[PDB]
């Protein structure tokens, strides 16, 4: 129950400085996104697959909510925003493979800087 609010505080504490509410600027944090058709459509083609296109870099406000990123990603790929699960990159090789989604509760309400750890372009996989 309490894990959702606990984790959210541990991250969001930076907001007194980094959530500095302003216009679009260098706060345009880049995020590397890739989708995959294999787990749904079965189009395993080598053409212009809008599924398996190059790392789609969305440059958006780190100081603003992940909610704006979700709705943007929803329209561009056609994924339901309620079902947009973000999966962060790890040391994903022989020795370590820990794939998990972000908490859709916390990580659709607070800022995306808390999740990135102030890096750009932040590599991520999209899930429905």
From Swiss-Prot:
Free-text domain note: The C-terminus plays a role in its oligomerization.
Fill in the PTM field for this protein: Isoform 1: Phosphorylated. Isoform 2: Not phosphorylated.
- Name-wise, this protein is Ubiquitin carboxyl-terminal hydrolase 7
| Disease note | Hao-Fountain syndrome: An autosomal dominant neurodevelopmental disorder characterized by global developmental delay, varying degrees of intellectual disability, autism spectrum disorder, poor or absent speech, and mild facial dysmorphism. Most patients develop seizures. Additional variable features include hypotonia, hypogonadism in males, and ocular anomalies.
Q: Origin organism of this chain?
A: Homo sapiens
According to its UniProt entry, the function of this protein is described as: Hydrolase that deubiquitinates target proteins such as ARMC5, FOXO4, DEPTOR, KAT5, p53/TP53, MDM2, ERCC6, DNMT1, UHRF1, PTEN, KMT2E/MLL5 and DAXX. Together with DAXX, prevents MDM2 self-ubiquitination and enhances the E3 ligase activity of MDM2 towards p53/TP53, thereby promoting p53/TP53 ubiquitination and proteasomal degradation. Deubiquitinates p53/TP53, preventing degradation of p53/TP53, and enhances p53/TP53-dependent transcription regulation, cell growth repression and apoptosis. (Microbial infection) Contributes to the overall stabilization and trans-activation capability of the herpesvirus 1 trans-acting transcriptional protein ICP0/VMW110 during HSV-1 infection.
Q: Where in the cell is it found?
A: Nucleus; Cytoplasm; Nucleus, PML body; Chromosome
Q: Which family does it belong to?
A: Belongs to the peptidase C19 family.
What is its induction behaviour? Up-regulated in regulatory T-cells (Treg). Down-regulated during neural progenitor cell differentiation.
Quaternary structure (record): Monomer. Homodimer. Part of a complex with DAXX, MDM2, RASSF1 and USP7. Part of a complex with DAXX, MDM2 and USP7. Interacts with MDM2; the interaction is independent of p53/TP53. Interacts with DAXX; the interaction is direct and independent of MDM2 and p53/TP53. Component of a complex composed of KMT2E/MLL5 (isoform 3), OGT (isoform 1) and USP7; the complex stabilizes KMT2E/MLL5, preventing KMT2E/MLL5 ubiquitination and proteasomal-mediated degradation. Interacts (via MATH domain) with KMT2E/MLL5 isoform 3. Interacts with OGT isoform 1.
Q: What is the tissue localization of expression for this protein?
A: Expressed in neural progenitor cells (at protein level). Widely expressed. Overexpressed in prostate cancer.
